[PDB]
Amino acid sequence: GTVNWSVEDIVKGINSNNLESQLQATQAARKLLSREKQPPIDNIIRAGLIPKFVSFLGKTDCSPIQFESAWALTNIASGTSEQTKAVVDGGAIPAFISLLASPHAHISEQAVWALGNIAGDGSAFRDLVIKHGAIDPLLALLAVPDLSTLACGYLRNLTWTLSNLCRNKNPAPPLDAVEQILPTLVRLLHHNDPEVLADSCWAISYLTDGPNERIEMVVKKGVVPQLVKLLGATELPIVTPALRAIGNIVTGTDEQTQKVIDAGALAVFPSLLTNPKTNIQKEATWTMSNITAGRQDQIQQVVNHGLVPFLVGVLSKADFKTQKEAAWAITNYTSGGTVEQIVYLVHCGIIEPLMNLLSAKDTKIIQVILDAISNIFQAAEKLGETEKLSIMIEECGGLDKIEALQRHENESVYKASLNLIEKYFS
Amino acid sequence: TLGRNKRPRL
């Protein structure tokens, strides 16, 4: 019936004075736009069909054409920012928000989806969706005693669209919109479906990606323990956003970092720092670096959980970017730690993998490492054991690499190197 | 869904 029409036939049907002919043509458009290989989005836009679809969204008397037009417009809005803009410019936003009230759940769902694509374009369309009043009717759809009574596809779409209203920066979402949405995110974060949980963690990870005030809004809602629990999930689509959220939170104040520690996050990091997915290992090492930048009692909890040998491990062998995060974790540790903690770090074997990384072609990591070596030499000075440390660096081949760096290109490198040789290797 | 910012309905 409606399989593989031409754009010309769709146009002729939508321009007929016959609601049923329009409905068949609109469904044909939906099927064209639903095919996976090169949907003719631009031809549909050039044919002037968007204003027609938008008007069909408002035909309460004909719910099937509401659905078909909602689906067609959803897939146009899923394209480039220029294609999403065409949908917005046709007035789709208020029309989709009206459809959130629809008594047909498959139509309400499609309006949820479309608004997610529009909001997902970026900050401007996200805030415009919010200004048109989308948040109240979206949250109303979740005002049930038990989320389990909703179809899980429906619930996944809602969670995903909410996550897009939490997404993006410059600017971040309006504070009052974030406060409005957070209680529902907290509830969704306790729902058993893996996809809902993942999308909820993504939303939280967006909201914690910013200044300390934004982090605080989230931490104050009490979700850190649930995030730590989700950090231990077996589904990697859950672990990835949960870990990103935890990592964002520990970029905050030392008190916010402490709530991640108190919730038990450090117990999960033996697995995360050896995780076979390179992105998880990198994000976990980054997170560790922002914990070793904290107080001495927080460094001490990293020590107590046995995580220093795991940092030595990733420094010794991992993807290069992970190793660079490990280098940072060590430079922060040595910068803020006590003498005892630095002594312990050396006893765990940090020196050799640290030197081995001076061979790398990345001048920033060379700076980070040289800074770490100075910090350790300073702790040795305080113990009068500068010489044991010089001997240890020399035996593993580190001296060779440091003089090689006397004649390095970057100026910060060669001045830090010379200083080290002048002072400790005379 | 997950971290996709846009997605069509196939």
Side-chain angles (χ1 to χ4, degrees):
Chain A
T2 54
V3 175
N4 191 37
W5 287 26
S6 71
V7 173
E8 175 168 55
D9 285 341
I10 288 166
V11 167
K12 182 68 178 189
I14 281 177
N15 287 343
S16 73
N17 291 319
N18 183 315
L19 181 62
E20 289 296 311
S21 300
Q22 297 173 318
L23 165 57
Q24 291 166 30
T26 301
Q27 174 178 99
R30 177 266 290 186
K31 292 182 179 184
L32 276 203
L33 294 159
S34 280
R35 83 202 206 199
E36 206 169 13
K37 196 50 159 64
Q38 319 153 258
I41 292 172
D42 279 328
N43 289 337
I44 298 287
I45 297 176
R46 279 184 217 110
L49 291 178
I50 289 200
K52 303 295 303 204
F53 293 157
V54 169
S55 66
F56 293 163
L57 294 180
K59 285 191 182 302
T60 305
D61 51 292
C62 183
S63 77
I65 205 174
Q66 293 184 311
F67 176 63
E68 293 292 347
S69 74
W71 186 343
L73 288 166
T74 290
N75 286 14
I76 297 172
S78 74
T80 68
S81 304
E82 198 185 303
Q83 289 168 356
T84 302
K85 176 174 183 292
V87 172
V88 171
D89 287 4
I93 290 178
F96 276 125
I97 290 168
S98 290
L99 271 192
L100 293 177
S102 163
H104 307 277
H106 69 114
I107 288 171
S108 178
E109 181 178 28
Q110 201 60 54
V112 165
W113 196 326
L115 291 169
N117 281 338
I118 292 171
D121 180 70
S123 287
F125 281 165
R126 173 203 75 204
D127 292 337
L128 186 51
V129 165
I130 291 169
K131 277 191 173 295
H132 279 85
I135 292 179
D136 287 332
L138 290 160
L139 299 182
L141 294 172
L142 293 171
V144 298
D146 186 4
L147 295 173
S148 274
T149 64
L150 303 180
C152 72
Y154 191 82
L155 180 50
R156 284 157 186 179
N157 275 317
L158 267 154
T159 308
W160 172 76
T161 287
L162 283 180
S163 80
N164 268 1
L165 294 173
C166 295
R167 203 206 287 238
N168 279 306
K169 290 163 71 179
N170 307 127
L175 294 189
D176 46 282
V178 175
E179 278 307 330
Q180 198 177 352
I181 290 176
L182 262 168
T184 294
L185 284 180
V186 176
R187 179 169 187 228
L188 289 164
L189 207 62
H190 282 74
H191 182 78
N192 74 46
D193 179 72
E195 248 197 80
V196 170
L197 290 173
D199 291 339
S200 299
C201 287
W202 278 117
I204 296 291
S205 87
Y206 306 147
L207 295 175
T208 57
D209 184 5
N212 290 352
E213 292 74 13
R214 298 292 183 137
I215 294 171
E216 192 57 19
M217 318 178 51
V218 175
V219 173
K220 267 215 181 53
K221 242 66 181 55
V223 297
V224 162
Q226 184 70 354
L227 287 169
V228 168
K229 168 179 183 178
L230 293 175
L231 199 61
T234 63
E235 303 89 343
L236 255 47
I238 293 170
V239 178
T240 297
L243 177 56
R244 170 105 49 177
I246 294 288
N248 289 340
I249 290 169
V250 302
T251 68
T253 66
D254 287 338
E255 277 83 8
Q256 293 166 335
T257 298
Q258 189 58 43
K259 295 183 163 162
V260 173
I261 298 160
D262 290 344
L266 293 181
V268 189
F269 273 74
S271 287
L272 301 171
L273 295 164
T274 49
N275 190 286
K277 289 298 171 307
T278 172
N279 287 336
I280 299 284
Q281 213 179 100
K282 189 170 68 71
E283 295 266 319
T285 305
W286 169 67
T287 300
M288 290 305 305
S289 74
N290 286 312
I291 294 175
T292 59
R295 309 180 229 117
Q296 291 181 340
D297 66 279
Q298 293 171 335
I299 293 168
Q300 186 57 37
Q301 292 197 266
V302 171
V303 167
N304 295 351
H305 277 88
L307 293 183
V308 171
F310 283 96
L311 291 174
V312 172
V314 291
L315 205 67
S316 312
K317 186 182 160 82
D319 188 81
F320 176 68
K321 302 179 147 232
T322 301
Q323 290 182 301
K324 187 164 185 202
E325 295 296 343
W328 273 117
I330 299 308
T331 294
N332 295 350
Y333 183 112
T334 59
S335 150
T338 65
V339 168
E340 289 78 31
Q341 292 168 338
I342 298 169
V343 165
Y344 171 76
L345 179 73
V346 165
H347 288 185
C348 288
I350 202 74
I351 294 298
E352 180 172 312
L354 217 42
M355 299 300 140
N356 290 354
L357 276 171
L358 286 179
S359 302
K361 290 316 177 304
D362 184 287
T363 307
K364 188 52 163 172
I365 193 158
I366 295 199
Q367 300 179 338
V368 170
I369 290 168
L370 293 164
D371 209 57
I373 292 161
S374 299
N375 291 332
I376 301 164
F377 263 116
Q378 288 173 359
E381 268 156 16
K382 299 195 38 170
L383 284 171
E385 310 167 341
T386 47
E387 269 333 280
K388 293 179 179 179
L389 176 57
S390 300
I391 299 160
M392 183 176 282
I393 293 169
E394 195 226 323
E395 267 167 2
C396 73
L399 193 271
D400 293 353
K401 302 190 187 68
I402 296 181
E403 311 183 27
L405 295 171
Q406 280 188 131
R407 76 203 155 165
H408 191 267
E409 180 274 342
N410 169 280
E411 177 228 23
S412 188
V413 165
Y414 66 71
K415 273 201 158 202
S417 325
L418 283 143
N419 191 304
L420 274 168
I421 300 189
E422 307 308 2
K423 189 179 300 190
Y424 302 115
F425 303 97
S426 51
Chain B
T1 44
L2 300 190
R4 299 175 66 190
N5 64 294
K6 294 183 197 181
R7 63 200 174 84
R9 181 184 173 152
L10 305 173

